[PDB]
């Protein structure tokens, strides 16, 4: 009866999400990396 | 209303971004001007309801 009379008993709907792309940035000297990445740098440097 | 379907769908097509608010902000003004077109300047109250609804 609600649908026939344009009434409703409650309803819901939205839309989904799509890909969003973000990144980071670097810095020289006083740099944007971490001590973590510096230790990694030793490893990949000796490896390469 | 089509307005709600457009709201959800453009929320999907817009969420990728990070500053949707100003995009919608500018999107408002063409509606302002169209409304100025269809209705006079003594109908400011109906202007206000359309403001609020949109």
């Amino acid at each position: 009866h609600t649908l026939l009379a344009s009434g409703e008993d409650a309803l819901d709907f939205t839309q989904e999400s799509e890909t969003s792309y973000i990144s980071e940035s670097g810095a020289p000297g006083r740099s944007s990396l971490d001590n973590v990445e510096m230790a990694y740098a030793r490893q990949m440097y000796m490896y390469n | 209303s089509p307005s709600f379907t457009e709201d959800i769908t453009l929320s999907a097509v817009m969420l990728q971004e990070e500053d949707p608010g100003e995009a919608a902000t500018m999107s408002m003004y063409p509606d302002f001007l169209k409304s100025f077109l269809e209705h006079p300047s003594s109908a400011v109250f109906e202007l206000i309801e359309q403001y609020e609804a949109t």
Side-chain angles (χ1 to χ4, degrees):
Chain A
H1 305 165
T2 54
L3 57 89
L4 293 166
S6 284
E8 297 291 310
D9 299 323
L11 73 164
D12 48 14
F13 196 54
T14 46
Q15 276 294 321
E16 54 173 71
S17 306
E18 277 167 278
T19 69
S20 190
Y21 290 90
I22 61 168
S23 292
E24 296 189 343
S25 179
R30 191 87 266 174
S31 292
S32 182
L33 293 177
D34 201 11
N35 50 17
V36 187
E37 306 326 302
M38 182 179 71
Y40 296 166
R42 273 166 286 164
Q43 309 289 337
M44 283 74 75
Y45 171 55
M46 61 79 71
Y47 169 82
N48 278 350
Chain B
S1 86
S3 302
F4 301 150
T5 300
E6 294 149 351
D7 286 325
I8 53 167
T9 310
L10 271 167
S11 299
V13 178
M14 185 64 72
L15 172 69
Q16 295 82 17
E17 295 158 75
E18 305 299 327
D19 189 358
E22 271 315 326
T25 300
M26 283 74 74
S27 313
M28 294 183 286
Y29 308 112
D31 292 331
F32 292 173
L33 302 175
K34 295 184 295 273
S35 307
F36 304 146
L37 173 146
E38 293 91 8
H39 272 299
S41 303
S42 297
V44 290
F45 282 133
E46 175 181 16
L47 181 69
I48 297 169
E49 292 84 4
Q50 288 324 284
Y51 277 133
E52 290 166 39
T54 49

